[PDB]
Design a protein around this ligand. Structure first.
Ligand SMILES: NC(=O)c1ccc[n+]([C@@H]2O[C@H](COP(=O)([O-])OP(=O)(O)OC[C@H]3O[C@@H](n4cnc5c(N)ncnc54)[C@H](O)[C@@H]3O)[C@@H](O)[C@H]2O)c1
Length: 178
């Protein structure tokens, strides 16, 4: 018994999708009690102890798991893995999204579009006032709002980070409406 690699696969299924296999109990913070996890999945035919599951979470190295102080609670960080999982929850996606930017880099951003200037980068403005507010950072602002039509039709699903900001994978400026 004790298939370490299978416990990890099974883990990512149980605490991250469907805890009901082993009877895992999920927190509001998206954590699961390890103590439950190894105990309940032990009964599920895994035969691992706390540190053996700690060994699974020790193989978290692909940035898909994490453990606590006593190691008594784990979170599998992953899901809507844009990066990993720090603020990419599939929430209510707006089709039309505003984005404040500034005028000299307006020429730049309307020429190139709000795109990869970092890995998975395009956070647009959730409100017109914030849009214009952030544009003022370089000097003169311009609001660049992508037309819902182009993006909804384009099959883009959007996601939001913790600040309630509207993210898209990439907005070519042709979809952007100045
Ligand atoms: N304040 C916060 O904590 C927070 C958190 C998440 C998102 N946001 C959002 O981010 C925006 C505010 O700016 P920021 O936080 O990204 O700061 P930032 O300092 O990263 O600003 C980057 C600037 O470069 C511009 N830019 C992006 N692509 C460009 C391109 N291809 N060519 C030329 N210029 C380009 C951006 O429009 C912006 O003017 C708003 O939409 C805001 O809602 C703010």
């Amino acid at each position: 018994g004790s298939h370490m690699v299978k416990v990890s696969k099974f883990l990512s299924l149980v605490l991250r999708h469907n805890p009901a296999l082993i009877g895992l109990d999920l927190d509001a913070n998206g954590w699961a009690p390890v103590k439950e996890l190894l105990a309940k999945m032990k009964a599920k035919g895994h035969g691992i102890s706390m540190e053996e599951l700690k060994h699974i979470v020790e193989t978290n190295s692909k940035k898909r798991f994490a453990f606590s102080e006593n190691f008594e609670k784990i979170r599998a960080n992953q899901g809507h893995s844009v990066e990993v999982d720090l603020g990419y929850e599939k929430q209510v996606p707006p089709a039309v999204l505003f984005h404040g930017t500034a005028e000299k880099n307006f020429d730049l951003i309307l020429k190139d579009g709000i795109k990869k200037m970092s890995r998975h980068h395009v956070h647009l403005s959730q409100d017109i006032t914030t849009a214009r507010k952030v544009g003022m950072r370089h000097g003169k602002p311009v609001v660049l709002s992508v037309d819902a039509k182009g993006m909804a039709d384009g099959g883009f699903d959007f996601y939001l980070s913790n600040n309630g900001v509207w993210l898209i994978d990439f907005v070519p400026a042709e979809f952007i409406k100045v």
